[PDB]
Ligand binder design. Structure first.
Ligand code: ATP
Ligand code: ADP
Lengths: 507, 52, 49, 479, 40
């Protein structure tokens, strides 16, 4: 720091000395300007008008230049002077973003203070190449059960969350965010803390405020940031927000830390790109989209990566979100993102209303990484679980017709129903990995087959309270060793036996 | 103690910020008054532009 | 116990930074004196027990 | 060297003006005054000494009036035994971070195909160690092979298994071309080849390297790269292979991942290049842009290139123009299915859509031909009973129909086999099944010697003897 | 109707041939003792 009179005034006095290109707007319409001049413009650079509004130059035609505006076009008047700053569009990075809400360009909208960050980063960047990478070996604890068991997620992955409207997409992401506060509070190792970024494209400010409220109510903002490019926000801001999020996440990825980024309504980005190109008179493709949509999403998703031990060892996981219409995944955007993602998490309304919540279809849903992003203790249970659920899914359709079956098949149906009733969860109620392991142990070793299906929802909670009270040591041992030795196996079985003795259910 | 020092540093920063802010506002207002008041500054600025 | 013996001592604040970064340097001095006066008695009780 | 000036910039398209000596089409231009190297490929002539070009790298940071230098030839990639063991870009630059390519020669990626007078060779049989492949769709040693499938069916996994079971034993060379696939996948392929001796990197005390041995070359035009690069990286790898074919007379292998991206990266720029769109959204110049490649991919009287192309099939729709036009260009075909992959039958090959020019009684004997056709008849009968079973039930079926259904189900289970590459998914070890063993087992199953054996034992068994071993085990644990 | 028929068929076939495979596993080692490791 420094003192005002003797230093700052001298500095400004030394600063004031100075003396001795520009263009003019030619056409204006629909949040877009066409200028004449500025022959020394970089394609993609920031531009400043004579009223404070900003813009981005995209079409460097021969006669004119095509700029997209970050706001309303009432300020531009077909003749206003325009000046280029020379900066490519960039955003601040650092821990000053944690706990804050910002627009597509890093300008805060929380209403509490400016952004204390000194280092910036370019929005559109080259992804990291083949050599500075490694395989995915660490898990990303989502807090859910069916995800963490059957569709695991690693640190460095790019897993899609695809479904219909009102199916639990944001809720899945919010539980993924909420599960991390324990992991972060119970350490000071930044290599182990998981920071989070939530980009919201097309959402309404009421929804974003509800999300911020749900996170503040659970202390889940000191390790997150939010990037709100809502519907009133212009098309270029909606189109730029996810690249800004990836720029904010590359600081973690490169600085040895970890991160997760959730693009919410990733189809509104493509809508905005269509809008921009069609108002820039670019010709469309199919569904009126351009052909550069693949190169629009590939640039973005290839920034998620797991770096090597020479580049710090960081990671940036990605969890894009997509809304389909009538379950049509034969469309263009779903097809592109499935062809450029490391997995899928499908969500259905039939399963959402049948009683399965989260309504994850574990057949279509996959994760190419798979067990490598899974703990051994969870592998042991989840292999059997996947096998049993495959069998149940095969057999239940024929079983429902009232036929009479043997015991080897009745056991399949019973175990499948038990697991299907176990994997249900309330919203904003995530669980630790050790507790998931214990619950799925109870479900897999047959301590729920005779029990009634409707009673499992309270079996689960009572067992959770029981093991949290009297058998925390088993949980700590599983959390540390990350496996199930015979000792922990026996201790857990004994705890379950004590619980079933102490308690009584309808069967 | 660390949180105390972070708070006091931030307070000092905002102090110096507001200080230079008002120092500029007031210098600007003083010049906007003196220019419109005095006749000499007009021809002085004329000569300044000419020689510039 | 495990918590307060896993990191060991990563805090270890250094007044060389703050004496420079701060302009008052009138209450900072008394505060630092308090700090070193409490840390002395802490290490005293530690070595005594 | 000529000199030109950028006139306008639109995405991956750059219009350039020269004062004299316009360059021919497909020639390469270098941008001067840029951060990194930036190459442009001519595509059109517009008049007034103006041309239109496609950029290999991103146009971000480009300015109008920036200067451009013509090279007098298209993108020339280096060639020799010095590219072996090494990774290269579309423009020949290495991206393995091991040094520059000390090649004594370069070839233009744009060449003319071998004429009709340069004939093929005998339809040599290729042994992969895969059962359904070796039986129903035999792969040719000197002909093109196709792996058609959507997303999540095991294309690059099948290619990795083929590489393990062919390239290591191969005495000739091999080339891999990644056209718009994942970078994790590229890293994994490079690591596995360095592990399994397909690449032999030896660092030196003076900071250099030595790739001696290393009978493989790799090329990458991955997703992060723009169009023009995704398009031309296949031509680059194909020139790298044409070098070994023509001059060294070697036998060569050529794996390509997501060739569909080529067409996609054409359609991404066609409407910017002023072409009218064709049907659903691909470009007009699909069949010619694909044929100029495929006809360069062929055996000649100097060498041979066995090629294996993976074809993305969007939404599992084989009526799409790109696969429709690509089926005609292949000697062997292999179509993967989701209805089959859902059953855990891996490889998820549909033997009623897979074909091959080789499956004829004169090439493979009648013991093979009749076995294959009997298998296909059995599987079609089982498919022509699915509705009867779904509606009425097994109670209605005669014992002939029960025996046929059981044989078809057993055959389906028998076809699936574990892979070494899939060990990190399944944990089971991998198998290599020779062709006489496959033919013996299929003849046995069709003759009815093993109908009594249970279907589960049949599943995930490399050989019939293994099936017996698992049935014995299951009976022991049954009692 | 499509997934309905497919899953019904798959379940029925699975059950039927599970029963048949159980029976065959019962009656295998008798009629094929050359595989039985009891005699090896
Ligand atoms: N496990 C759950 N249990 C009960 N209700 C749920 C659960 N998950 C989601 N819901 C409901 O799903 C609704 C939509 O939440 P979300 O923010 O994910 O919308 P969306 O799926 O992104 O669709 P859109 O953005 O178009 O509105 C919410 O009203 C929520 O009540
Ligand atoms: N032998 C196999 N057994 C089980 N699953 C497999 C097997 N091979 C591939 N899979 C799956 O195939 C998928 C790989 O798809 P890939 O061919 O790489 O790309 P694409 O989706 O475009 O076809 C992985 O999810 C992988 O788990």
């Amino acid at each position: 720091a420094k003192i005002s009179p003797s230093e700052m005034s001298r500095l400004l006095e030394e600063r004031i000395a100075g003396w001795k290109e520009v263009g003019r707007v030619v056409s204006v319409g629909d949040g877009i300007a066409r200028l004449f001049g500025l022959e020394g413009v970089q394609a993609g650079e920031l531009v400043e008008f004579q009223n404070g509004m900003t813009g981005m130059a995209l079409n460097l035609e021969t006669d004119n230049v095509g700029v997209v505006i970050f706001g309303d076009d009432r300020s531009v008047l077909e003749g206003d002077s325009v000046k280029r700053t020379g900066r490519i569009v960039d955003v601040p990075i650092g821990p000053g973003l944690l706990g804050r809400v910002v627009d597509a360009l890093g300008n805060p909208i929380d209403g509490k203070g400016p952004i204390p960050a000194k280092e910036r980063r370019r929005v559109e960047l080259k992804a990291p190449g083949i050599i500075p990478r490694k395989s995915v070996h660490e898990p990303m604890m989502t807090g859910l059960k069916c995800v963490d068991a059957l569709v695991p997620v690693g640190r460095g992955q790019r897993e899609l969350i695809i479904g219909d409207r009102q199916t639990g997409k944001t809720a899945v992401a919010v539980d993924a965010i909420i599960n991390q506060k324990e992991i972060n509070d119970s350490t000071d190792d930044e290599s182990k803390k998981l920071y989070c970024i939530y980009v919201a494209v097309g959402q309404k400010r009421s929804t974003v405020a509800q999300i911020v409220k749900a996170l503040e109510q659970r202390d889940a903002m000191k390790y997150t940031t939010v990037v709100a490019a809502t519907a009133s926000e212009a098309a270029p801001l909606q189109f730029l927000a996810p690249y800004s999020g990836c720029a904010m996440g590359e600081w973690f990825r490169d600085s040895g830390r970890h991160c997760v980024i959730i693009y919410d309504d990733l189809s509104k980005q493509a809508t905005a790109y269509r809008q921009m190109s069609l108002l820039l008179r670019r010709p469309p493709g199919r569904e009126a989209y351009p052909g550069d949509v693949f190169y629009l999403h590939s640039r973005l998703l290839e920034r998620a990566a797991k770096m090597g031990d020479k580049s710090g060892g960081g990671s940036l996981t990605a969890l894009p979100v997509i809304e389909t219409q009538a379950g049509d995944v034969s469309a263009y955007i779903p097809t592109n993102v499935i062809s450029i993602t490391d997995g899928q998490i499908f969500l259905e309304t039939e399963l959402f209303y049948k009683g399965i919540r989260p309504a994850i279809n574990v057949g279509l849903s996959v994760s190419r990484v798979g067990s490598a992003a899974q703990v051994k203790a969870m592998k042991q249970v989840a292999g059997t679980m996947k096998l049993e659920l495959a069998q149940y899914r095969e057999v239940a359709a024929f079983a429902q017709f009232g036929s009479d079956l043997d015991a080897s098949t009745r056991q399949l149906l019973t175990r499948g129903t038990a697991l299907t009733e176990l994997l249900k969860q309330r919203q904003y109620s995530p669980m630790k990995n050790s507790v998931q392991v214990c619950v799925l142990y109870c479900g897999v070793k047959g301590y729920l087959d005779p029990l009634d299906p409707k009673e499992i929802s309270r079996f689960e909670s009572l067992f959770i309270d029981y093991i949290n009270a009297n058998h925390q040591d088993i949980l700590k041992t599983i959390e540390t060793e990350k496996e199930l030795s015979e000792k922990t196996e026996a201790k857990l079985r004994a705890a379950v036996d004590e619980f079933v003795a102490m308690n009584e259910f309808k069967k | 103690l660390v949180e105390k020092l972070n708070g006091i540093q931030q307070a000092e920063k905002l102090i110096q910020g507001s200080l230079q802010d008002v120092m500029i506002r007031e210098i600007v207002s003083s010049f906007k008054d003196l220019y419109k008041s005095r006749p000499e500054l007009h021809d002085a600025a004329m000569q300044s532009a000419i020689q510039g | 116990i495990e918590r307060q013996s896993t990191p060991g001592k990563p805090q270890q604040i250094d007044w060389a930074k703050w004496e420079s970064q701060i302009a008052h340097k009138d209450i900072l001095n008394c505060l630092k004196t308090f700090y070193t006066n409490q840390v002395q008695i802490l290490d005293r009780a530690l070595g005594a027990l | 060297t000529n000199h030109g000036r950028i006139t306008q910039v639109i995405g991956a398209v750059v219009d350039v003006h020269f004062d004299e000596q316009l360059p021919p089409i497909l020639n390469s231009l270098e941008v001067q005054g840029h951060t990194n190297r930036l190459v442009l490929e001519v595509a059109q002539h517009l008049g007034e000494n103006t041309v239109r070009t496609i950029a290999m790298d991103a146009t971000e940071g480009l300015v109008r009036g920036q200067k451009v230098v013509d090279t007098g030839a298209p993108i020339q990639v280096p060639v020799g035994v010095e590219t072996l063991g090494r990774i290269m870009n579309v423009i020949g630059e290495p991206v393995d971070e091991c040094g520059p390519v000390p090649a004594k020669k370069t070839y233009s990626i744009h060449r003319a195909a071998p004429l009709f007078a340069d004939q093929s060779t005998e339809p040599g049989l290729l042994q992969t160690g895969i059962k359904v492949v070796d039986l129903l769709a035999p792969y040719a040693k000197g002909g093109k092979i196709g792996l058609f499938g959507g997303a999540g069916v095991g294309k690059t996994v099948l290619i990795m298994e083929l590489i393990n079971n062919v390239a290591n034993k191969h005495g000739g060379f091999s080339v891999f071309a990644g056209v718009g696939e994942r970078t994790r996948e590229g890293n994994d392929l490079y690591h596995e080849m360095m592990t399994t001796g397909v690449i032999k990197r030896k660092k030196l005390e003076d900071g250099k390297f030595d790739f001696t041995g290393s009978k493989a070359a790799l090329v990458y035009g991955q997703m992060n790269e723009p169009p023009g690069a995704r398009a031309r990286v296949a031509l680059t790898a194909l020139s790298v292979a044409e070098y070994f074919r023509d001059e060294q007379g070697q036998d060569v292998l050529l794996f390509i991942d997501n060739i569909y991206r080529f067409t996609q990266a054409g359609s991404e720029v066609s409407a910017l290049l002023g072409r009218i769109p064709s049907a659903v959204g691909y470009q007009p110049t699909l069949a010619t842009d694909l044929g100029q490649l495929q006809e360069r991919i062929t055996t000649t009287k100097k060498g041979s290139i066995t090629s294996v192309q993976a074809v993305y099939v969007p939404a599992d729709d084989l009526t799409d123009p790109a696969p429709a036009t690509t089926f005609a260009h292949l000697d062997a075909t292999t179509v993967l299915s989701r209805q089959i992959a859902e059953l855990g039958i891996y490889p998820a090959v549909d033997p009623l859509d897979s074909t091959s020019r080789m499956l004829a009684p004169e090439i493979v004997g009648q013991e093979h031909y009749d076995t294959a056709r009997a298998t296909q008849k059995l599987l079609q009968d089982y498919k022509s009973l699915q509705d009867i079973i779904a509606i009425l039930g097994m109670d209605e079926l005669s014992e002939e129909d029960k025996l046929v259904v059981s044989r078809a189900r057993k055959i389906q289970r028998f076809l699936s086999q574990p892979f070494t590459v899939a060990e990190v998914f399944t944990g089971k070890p991998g198998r290599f099944v020779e062709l006489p063993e496959t033919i013996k087992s299929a003849q046995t199953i069709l003759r009815g010697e093993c109908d009594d054996l249970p279907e589960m034992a049949f599943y995930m068994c490399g050989g019939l003897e293994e099936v017996r071993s698992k049935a014995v085990k299951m009976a022991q644990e049954a009692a | 109707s499509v997934k309905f028929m497919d899953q019904k068929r798959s379940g029925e076939e699975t059950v039927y041939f599970k029963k048949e495979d159980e029976a065959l596993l019962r009656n295998l080692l008798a009629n094929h003792p050359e595989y039985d490791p009891k005699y090896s």
